């Protein structure tokens, strides 16, 4: 359901291209009219993933980097919602890959946590900083690790994301993988540089927060 108080934002959300075209034909300014959250038709089109509508808006020359009241840009919205083709179009029209919202998150953070593989590759090929830290000092790798997104970790590693960045609690992605008992993800991380010796702010290493026999599994890998 769409919460926008604007008719035009609702048209964009429900994918009514023709009706939207008529509205905007009747009043050009509607293309960039902001609702109660400073979202325009573009934000809402990205959310619902209506590619043709985004394409139309873009060719009208609407701004593509304006943030809503929560700091979310169209790219943030498209990446989170998993809108492959829209992300591609946005990046093609100069969307800022490293834009942050009020939480300090880039579009990559959401791609990574939500397991948007194609979008992640797009963002990273587009120059996204893999080590970008949000206001919790967490990286995309933290998200991928916690959720147990193996493929996403491989992607991030190919683009040279660090495995040992500590968040605000002092946890590395390995701490998170171990706590959620994400076994294969934890092995991968270790096999590619993640330290089993780094302590969080409770002075625990990733082995000490590991559940099941995961601690010993990782200890073996490193220490035999």
């Amino acid at each position, epitope marked *: 359901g769409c919460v926008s108080n604007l008719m035009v934002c609702n048209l964009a959300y429900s994918g009514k291209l023709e009706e939207l075209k008529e509205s905007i034909l009747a009043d050009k300014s509607l293309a960039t009219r902001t609702d109660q959250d400073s979202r325009t038709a573009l934000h809402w089109a990205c959310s619902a993933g209506h590619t043709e509508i985004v394409e139309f808006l873009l060719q009208l020359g609407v701004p593509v980097n304006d943030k809503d009241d929560a700091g979310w840009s169209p790219l943030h919205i498209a990446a989170s919602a998993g809108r492959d083709e829209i992300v591609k179009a946005l990046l093609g029209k100069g969307a800022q890959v490293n834009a942050v919202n009020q939480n300090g998150c880039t579009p990559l953070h959401y791609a990574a946590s939500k397991n948007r593989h194609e979008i992640a590759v797009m963002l990273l*090929e*587009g120059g996204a900083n893999p080590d970008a830290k949000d206001h919790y000092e967490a990286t995309a790798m933290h998200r991928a690790a916690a959720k147990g997104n193996l493929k996403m970790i491989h992607i991030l590693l*190919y683009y040279k994301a660090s495995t040992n960045i500590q968040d605000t609690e002092g946890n590395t992605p390995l701490h998170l993988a171990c706590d959620e008992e994400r076994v*294969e993800e934890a*092995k991968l991380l270790v096999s590619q540089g993640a330290s089993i010796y780094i302590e969080n702010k409770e002075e625990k290493t990733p082995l000490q927060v590991a559940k099941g026999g995961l601690g010993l599994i990782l200890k073996r890998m490193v220490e035999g």
Partner: single-chain antibody
Amino acid sequence: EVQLVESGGSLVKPGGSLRLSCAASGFTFSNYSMNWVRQAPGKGLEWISSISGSSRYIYYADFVKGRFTISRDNATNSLYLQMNSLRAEDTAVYYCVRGVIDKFDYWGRGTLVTVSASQSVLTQPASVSGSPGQSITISCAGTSSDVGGYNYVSWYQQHPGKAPKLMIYEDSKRPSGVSNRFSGSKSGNTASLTISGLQAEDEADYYCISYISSNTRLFGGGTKLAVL
């Protein structure tokens, strides 16, 4: 339609130095990681080098050791490979390949390099006798360093003189446009491709590739599938 055309493949005396080129079209070249993969006669698919869209990230297989250098020009949609000091073990068909991680989705017809003048790390069966309509399985075996639960095996199909096709990647996932008669799985240090209801068009060569990291792609020696 996506097209990759390799050129520059010739015969050259050992010690010589070649330069391969690839003309790309049918997609946004600049947005894609590109690769060079070579295949010696009878041998498997050996990944050589990859380069990111922006040229920021470049990787080489261990054997390269400075002898090869990949480059690209997004402006003119072309990929290059500078090969120095050509040994005889370099004799192969060199393919230009689009893809990242384990997903090598587009290959060119390849260009042949001949140097005029020790098995594969992963182990496949040489031959597989199939009977139309039945069901067969090709195995890909390695050590615990080669095939694991936290990395991927991919399967590639190849007909005589044709661009290799990606059948399976990520152990078990298959690209759109590929028949569901093809499936893959893995147990311990061994991956298995399976085909059900064999065709005669299914008769071909099959190769496995274990993706370990950005600079490590292990390969099997190939498996000839004969459809009776």
